[PDB]
Write a protein that holds these residues in place. Structure first.
Motif, short mmCIF file in Angstrom:
data_model
loop_
_atom_site.label_atom_id
_atom_site.label_comp_id
_atom_site.label_asym_id
_atom_site.label_seq_id
_atom_site.Cartn_x
_atom_site.Cartn_y
_atom_site.Cartn_z
N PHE A 232 46.51 38.62 42.53
CA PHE A 232 46.44 38.48 40.99
C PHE A 232 45.48 36.55 40.61
O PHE A 232 46.09 36.18 41.80
N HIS A 233 44.78 36.30 40.05
CA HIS A 233 44.01 35.28 39.67
C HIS A 233 45.38 34.35 38.68
O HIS A 233 44.26 33.03 37.87
N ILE A 234 46.42 34.57 38.79
CA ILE A 234 47.68 33.13 37.67
C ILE A 234 47.10 32.30 38.06
O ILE A 234 47.41 31.80 36.88
N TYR A 235 46.05 32.02 39.33
CA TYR A 235 46.33 30.26 39.21
C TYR A 235 44.62 29.76 39.20
O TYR A 235 44.03 29.19 39.71
N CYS A 236 43.45 31.31 39.29
CA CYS A 236 42.42 30.80 39.62
C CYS A 236 41.75 31.41 38.25
O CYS A 236 40.68 30.81 38.09
N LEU A 237 42.24 31.26 36.87
CA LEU A 237 41.70 31.32 36.05
C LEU A 237 41.39 29.63 35.85
O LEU A 237 41.85 29.11 36.34
N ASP A 238 40.89 29.63 34.50
CA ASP A 238 40.39 27.98 34.50
C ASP A 238 41.65 27.22 33.93
O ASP A 238 42.15 26.48 34.66
N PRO A 239 41.83 28.00 33.59
CA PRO A 239 44.07 27.30 32.91
C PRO A 239 44.65 27.72 33.89
O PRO A 239 44.93 29.10 34.39
N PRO A 240 45.27 27.19 35.09
CA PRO A 240 46.46 27.96 36.14
C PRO A 240 47.94 27.86 35.63
O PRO A 240 48.47 27.76 35.00
N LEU A 241 48.33 29.30 35.35
CA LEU A 241 49.15 29.98 35.40
C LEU A 241 50.45 28.76 35.06
O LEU A 241 51.39 28.52 34.29
N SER A 242 50.49 28.24 36.29
CA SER A 242 51.39 27.59 36.83
C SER A 242 53.23 27.27 37.21
O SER A 242 53.30 26.47 37.43
N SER A 243 53.58 28.97 36.90
CA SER A 243 54.62 29.07 37.27
C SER A 243 54.67 30.06 38.43
O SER A 243 55.91 29.47 39.18
N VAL A 244 53.64 30.01 38.91
CA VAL A 244 53.76 30.86 40.78
C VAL A 244 54.94 31.24 40.69
O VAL A 244 55.82 30.12 41.48
N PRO A 245 55.14 32.52 40.03
CA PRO A 245 56.72 33.16 41.80
C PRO A 245 57.09 32.48 42.68
O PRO A 245 58.38 32.75 43.23
N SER A 246 56.16 32.14 43.43
CA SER A 246 56.84 32.18 45.29
C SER A 246 56.81 32.95 45.37
O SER A 246 56.79 33.73 46.64
N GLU A 247 57.56 34.02 44.79
CA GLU A 247 57.64 35.38 45.73
C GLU A 247 57.57 35.94 45.76
O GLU A 247 57.63 36.88 46.88
N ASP A 248 55.71 36.42 45.71
CA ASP A 248 55.12 37.28 46.05
C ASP A 248 55.07 38.29 46.16
O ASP A 248 54.34 39.04 46.51
N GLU A 249 56.08 39.05 45.88
CA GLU A 249 56.55 40.20 46.26
C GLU A 249 57.13 40.61 44.84
O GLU A 249 57.24 40.46 43.68
N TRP A 250 55.37 41.24 44.06
CA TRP A 250 55.95 41.95 42.88
C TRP A 250 54.90 43.01 42.61
O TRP A 250 53.91 42.90 43.70
N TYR A 251 53.88 43.67 41.45
CA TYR A 251 53.37 44.73 40.81
C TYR A 251 51.84 43.84 40.29
O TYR A 251 52.73 43.16 39.20
N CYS A 252 51.24 44.55 40.06
CA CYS A 252 50.15 43.31 39.37
C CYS A 252 49.99 44.23 38.31
O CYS A 252 49.92 46.00 38.11
#
Ligand code: ZN
Ligand code: ZN
Ligand code: ZN
Length: 69
Positions: free
Chosen positions: A43-63
């Motif tokens: 997912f682009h959570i961090y690729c968008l101009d503005p970074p989501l910043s939350s970065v769950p780190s779990e990497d385990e989830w559904y888009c």
């Protein structure tokens, strides 16, 4: 259980649309991206101009693309 390339190894371009975000198709940092087990895509959570910043780190989830199913 290390990461594997699906359409990258087969494609001479070696793009990671699967392992990497399809928008960038590789050339990114999959460590800051989250993978969807159902779609196996990043997912682009961090690729968008503005970074989501939350970065769950779990990497385990559904888009949200398949969560609406
Ligand atoms: Zn790949
Ligand atoms: Zn990207
Ligand atoms: Zn998904």
């Amino acid at each position: 259980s290390g990461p594997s390339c699906k359409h990258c190894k087969d494609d001479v371009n070696r793009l990671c649309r699967v392992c990497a975000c399809h928008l960038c198709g590789g050339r990114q940092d999959p460590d800051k991206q989250l993978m969807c087990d159902e779609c196996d895509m990043a997912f682009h959570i961090y690729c968008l101009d503005p970074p989501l910043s939350s970065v769950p780190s779990e990497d385990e989830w559904y888009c949200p693309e398949c969560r609406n199913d």
